[PDB]
Amino acid sequence: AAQTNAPWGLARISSTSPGTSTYYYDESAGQGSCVYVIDTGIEASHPEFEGRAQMVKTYYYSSRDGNGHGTHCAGTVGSRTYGVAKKTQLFGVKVLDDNGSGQYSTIIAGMDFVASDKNNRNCPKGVVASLSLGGGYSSSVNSAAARLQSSGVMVAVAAGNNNADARNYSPASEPSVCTVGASDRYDRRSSFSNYGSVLDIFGPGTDILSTWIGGSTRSISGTSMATPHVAGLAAYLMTLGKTTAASACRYIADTANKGDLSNIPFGTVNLLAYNNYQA
Ligand SMILES: [Ca+2]
């Protein structure tokens, strides 16, 4: 399949080169997979989700996304126009309030929730969780992310926007999950992206157009926007049978475009997420 005039990041993830504008992907499009977006919520009624989104949990007085961040991330996973995996099922877990804040105890509970809740959902091709959130190092946050992964979910987490080594942030620093850095449309590391040995992969993160609340769209930047490209990629590859939840981060690194990014510090991987789709 080909989507013309796609967001640059979708075109990037199906290309060996920067500077193209068509997204190429197998038509299976993540059908029969599931992706949990653990964030400020998802506006499930947005036409871009086509009835494939729902809220499954909140820790606040509403499950509505009163921020937009979670809706944007969900859209990069799985919206019809803006998404990597255009037929995946999306499940929202609102651990962040409408200011985008959340206590670590709530975030942990939401990760444990997903590990159980997958057993209540139909995801024959596998399960992914996208965590576009983080704060300072916490062994308890990292352990929650490790349990989610161990339970059979492909966990993708943002590296963070501090232009610093991700070893000092959680859940970015957890070794067993897939930690995602950000790039821009000229294959530079994004100015804000964290780096370090704990990174596994980079994805498009500067000037990413996706869904927003009120049935809208906008472009924003962050490791939070790189993470759902990887999460959606994982769902897409699992639907194809090419990998599993336990092996997908390694598969994505194995199959990534290598050596193409600039301003990568010595000791950080130079790997850009790529679907290797041959039309
Ligand atoms: Ca990691």
From Swiss-Prot:
Binds 2 calcium ions per subunit. Its EC number is 3.4.21.64. It catalyses: Hydrolysis of keratin, and of other proteins with subtilisin-like specificity. Hydrolyzes peptide amides. The active site is at D39, H69, S224. GO terms for molecular function: metal ion binding; serine-type endopeptidase activity. It is an enzyme of class 3 (hydrolase). Its cofactor is Ca(2+). Ca(2+) 2 binds at T16, D260. Ca(2+) 1 binds at P175, V177, D200. One of its GO terms (cellular component) is extracellular region. Disulfide bonds join C34-C123, C178-C249. Keywords: Calcium, Disulfide bond, Hydrolase, Metal-binding, Protease, Serine protease, Signal, Zymogen. GO terms for biological process: proteolysis. Hydrolyzes keratin at aromatic and hydrophobic residues. Belongs to the peptidase S8 family. This is Proteinase K. The chain holds residues 106 to 384 of 384 of the full protein.
